[PDB]
């Protein structure tokens, strides 16, 4: 994908993470488990919901009757009416088909970007207190208990608190 995360450096999805689109798996001495990142998930939901509603609600037509009746000496205008109906048909069909194709690529890129960004937000907090081991995973150079893990997830990881322990293990 465009942003290299989904089906990219993070090779697969998690059926085990049921409560959101993006998030975390942690493993420390007090246990392990999946947890959705609710904020990035909710932003994405709000965004996509807005997208679907825009695609839907921007179409607001007036009350109209498409049918027309012409007698056997009005074939030219009957054919004209047909040209109008057929013309609209070709436009709406082409535009609807392409719109879906193009916006689907964009929707998928968007999720890829959200995942990429989530990963970068963690990488940036942890710096060298953890090791990037691939597949979207970090291995800590220090014990990271639930309080620590929670702090990573809400962007308040305290790097200096753990830097000494991490340094020792890293060297």
């Amino acid at each position: 994908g465009l942003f290299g995360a989904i089906a990219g450096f993070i090779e697969g999805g998690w059926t085990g993470m049921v409560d959101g689109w993006y998030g975390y798996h942690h493993q420390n001495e007090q246990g392990s488990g999946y947890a959705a990142d609710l904020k990035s998930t909710q932003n994405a939901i709000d965004g996509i919901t807005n997208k679907v509603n825009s695609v839907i609600e921007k179409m607001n037509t007036q009350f109209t009757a498409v049918g027309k009746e012409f007698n056997h000496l009005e074939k030219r205008i009957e054919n004209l009416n047909k040209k109008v109906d057929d013309g609209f048909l070709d436009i709406w069909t082409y535009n609807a088909e392409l719109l879906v194709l193009l916006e689907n690529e964009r929707t998928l890129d968007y999720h890829d970007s959200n995942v990429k960004n989530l990963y970068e937000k963690v990488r940036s907090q942890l710096k060298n207190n953890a090791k990037e081991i691939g597949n979207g995973c970090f291995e800590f150079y220090h014990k990271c208990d639930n309080t620590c893990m929670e702090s990573v997830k809400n962007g308040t990881y305290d790097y200096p608190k753990y830097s000494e322990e991490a340094k020792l293990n890293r060297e």
Binding site: A7, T15, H26, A65, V66, T107, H111, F138, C144
Partner: protein, 326 residues
């Protein structure tokens, strides 16, 4: 010594929904929504909370002229569109042309008010002419010769058809739809036997309408056993305005007229699809559509506030992500 770990990842689930993207077909995603309405209720429904006028085995011509076969139909004082069936062929039982028929049909398509009234009462309007003998095998009713209910085929009384003059002032407060016919006999004999006078005219006028009719006597190919023809005309009399009829023969005179108020932009559905006590905002000939979706592939010819018709079979929009379970 293996350290604690934190992994970043994304949802997968059991969804088998696929979507197409500009780069790749049939991508399985975790969530998606359809943009294409492909479902209808197989019913002809009320539009704007008003039922359609269903003509049964009659077409609009049979209905508005009062073809004997249409007398059984119920006509509400209003309707949101009109339904004929593909086999509805009870129309002009006496052969001829219905002038500006498609225009009348468009005008009658929706109506907010519609009241029949005896414009020229049969029992009092024609003391100098015969208003009972104008029946024909071409328009049978209970196997007996009959005629359109809304028109009277005036005929000579005794051996005299004196000049006829008749007027109506529209005191209805709304448009009055008036219909009449002009009879064109097969032969000069038929002309005499019906109207006595050999050389006749009909004249019809309002502030707006004005036309003189001259019967064109000739043998046309038999249709419904008739070698003659009858042409049908209509006009809309403005409130306050007057319509006059003048004739020395060959005038199929109005009996009933219609005070009405036409209603905006509707149409006529021709279909066997049954009517039903259902409400809709979008009606197609094969069923009503109830959706907020922008596109539909049910039918190009719709009436109402409708989704745009497309040739597509599938307009699926991804909402979730690429679904990649273990």
């Amino acid at each position: 010594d293996p350290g604690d770990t934190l992994c970043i990842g994304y949802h997968a689930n059991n969804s088998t929904d696929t979507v197409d993207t500009v780069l790749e077909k049939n991508v399985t995603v975790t969530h998606s929504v359809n943009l294409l309405e492909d479902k209808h209720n197989g019913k002809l429904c009320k539009l704007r909370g008003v039922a359609p006028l269903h003509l049964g085995k009659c077409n609009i011509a049979g209905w508005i002229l009062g073809n004997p076969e249409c007398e059984s139909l119920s006509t509400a004082s209003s309707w949101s569109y009109i339904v004929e069936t593909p086999s509805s062929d009870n129309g002009t039982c006496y052969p001829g042309d219905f002038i500006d028929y498609e225009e009348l049909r468009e005008q009658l398509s929706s109506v907010s008010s519609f009241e029949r009234f005896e414009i020229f009462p049969k029992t009092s309007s024609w003391p100098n002419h015969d208003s009972n003998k104008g029946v024909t095998a071409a328009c049978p009713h209970a196997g007996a010769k009959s005629f359109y209910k809304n028109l009277i085929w005036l005929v000579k009384k005794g051996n005299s058809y004196p000049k006829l003059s008749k007027s109506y002032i529209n005191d209805k407060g709304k448009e009055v739809l008036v219909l009449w016919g002009i009879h064109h006999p097969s032969t000069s004999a038929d002309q005499q036997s019906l109207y006595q006078n050999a050389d006749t005219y009909v004249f019809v006028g309002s502030s707006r309408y004005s036309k003189k009719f001259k019967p064109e006597i000739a043998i046309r190919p038999k249709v419904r056993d008739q070698e003659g023809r009858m042409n049908y005309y209509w006009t809309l009399v403005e409130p306050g305005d007057k319509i006059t009829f003048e004739a020395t023969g060959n005038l199929v005179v109005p009996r009933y007229a219609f005070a009405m108020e036409r209603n905006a932009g509707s149409g006529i559905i021709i279909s066997d699809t049954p009517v039903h006590d259902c409400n809709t905002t979008c009606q197609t000939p094969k069923g009503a559509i109830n959706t907020s979706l922008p596109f539909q592939n049910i039918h190009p010819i719709t009436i109402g506030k409708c989704p745009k018709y497309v040739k597509s079979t599938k307009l699926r929009l991804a909402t979730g992500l690429r679904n990649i379970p273990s």
